[PDB]
Amino acid sequence: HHEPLTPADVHNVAFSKPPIGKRGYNEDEVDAFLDLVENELTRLIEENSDLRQRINELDQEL
Amino acid sequence: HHHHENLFYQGPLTPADVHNVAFSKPPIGKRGYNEDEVDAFLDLVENELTRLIEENSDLRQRINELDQEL
Amino acid sequence: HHHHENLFYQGPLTPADVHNVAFSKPPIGKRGYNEDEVDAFLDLVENELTRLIEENSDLRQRINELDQEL
Amino acid sequence: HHEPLTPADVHNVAFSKPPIGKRGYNEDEVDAFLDLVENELTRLIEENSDLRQRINELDQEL
């Protein structure tokens, strides 16, 4: 864990309140959707690096 | 890459989902998140997800071409 | 309630999303979840989400009718 | 936390492996989607009970 947009950016984004006196977006909904986002960016980055590793192995055999 | 290629990607979150996700208003009389900031952030999300899915598809195409050469 | 009423619900997960969500296969050469079991579970999810959104809409209609009577 | 389908059922569901020798569904994807599911069922149940509370308050005023 400690070694354009990153999963960490999604984890850390912080939003202000709506203007006076607006209401804004439900925070539970936005939170839950951003958790899906963070999970899927992370998984795609890991899977992309695995494909890249496989590519490396295949080039070494070429 | 282009703006309207079907890459036949299978996963539970697509750029179209990010683009179309809807949020209700908060429970009254709590307030929620600033809508401008969330909208702008989700545009960046749509862009990054698009790029990673495009990268996924290209790495898979390259692996198929290699697997052909081998 | 019926099977094709637009309740104008706003939220980030709808019955249609549950119905249409797609999953890729696992990273090779790990295996994943049984597809029959996941499919059946997600049908129950689609049903429960539908019922709760319908309940949400009826409670809101009742609150509007009360707010009219007051 | 300790007082048809429940959020807890989503939290606890456990799936077997695919048949020999099938591959099945990606587990990171299913996990992340079930987390969104659990979150949204929980939030709708809480919000529904709040609407019901408001209804109670309004009937008391009728």
Q: What is the 3-state secondary structure (H, E, C) of D6-47?
A: CHHHHHHCCCCCCCCCCCCECHHHHHHHHHHHHHHHHHHHHH
H or E stretch covering A51 = helix A27-60
Closest CA to D11 of D26, D3, D1: D1
Q: Does B10 touch chain C (CB under 8 A)?
A: yes
Q: Does C66 touch chain D (CB under 8 A)?
A: yes
Show residues of chain D in contact with B13, CB under 8 Å: 32
Q: Is C26–D30 a contact, with Cβ atoms under 8 angstroms apart?
A: no
B23 → chain D, closest CA residue: D40
C37–chain A nearest CA distance, Å:
22
Q: Does A44 touch chain B (CB under 8 A)?
A: yes
Closest CA to B42 of B62, B22, B69: B22
C21 → chain D, closest CA residue: D33
Please tell me what DSSP assigns to residue C4.
S
Q: Is D35–A36 a contact, with Cβ atoms under 8 angstroms apart?
A: yes
B11 → chain C, closest CA residue: C23
Longest dimension (CA), chain B: 64
Q: How was this structure determined?
A: X-ray
Q: Is C10–B24 a contact, with Cβ atoms under 8 angstroms apart?
A: yes
Measured CA to CA, the distance from residue D61 to residue C30 in angstroms comes to 61
Q: Is B59–A48 a contact, with Cβ atoms under 8 angstroms apart?
A: yes
Contact, C54 vs C1, CB < 8 A?
A: yes
Contact, B63 vs A51, CB < 8 A?
A: yes
Neighbours of D29 (CB within 10 A): 26
The two structure tokens encoding residue C39: 């499919």
Measured CA to CA, the distance from residue D43 to residue D30 in angstroms comes to 20
Please tell me what DSSP assigns to residue D40.
H
Q: Domain spans of chain D?
A: 7-60
Q: Is B31–A18 a contact, with Cβ atoms under 8 angstroms apart?
A: yes
Distance from chain centroid for Cα C13: 7
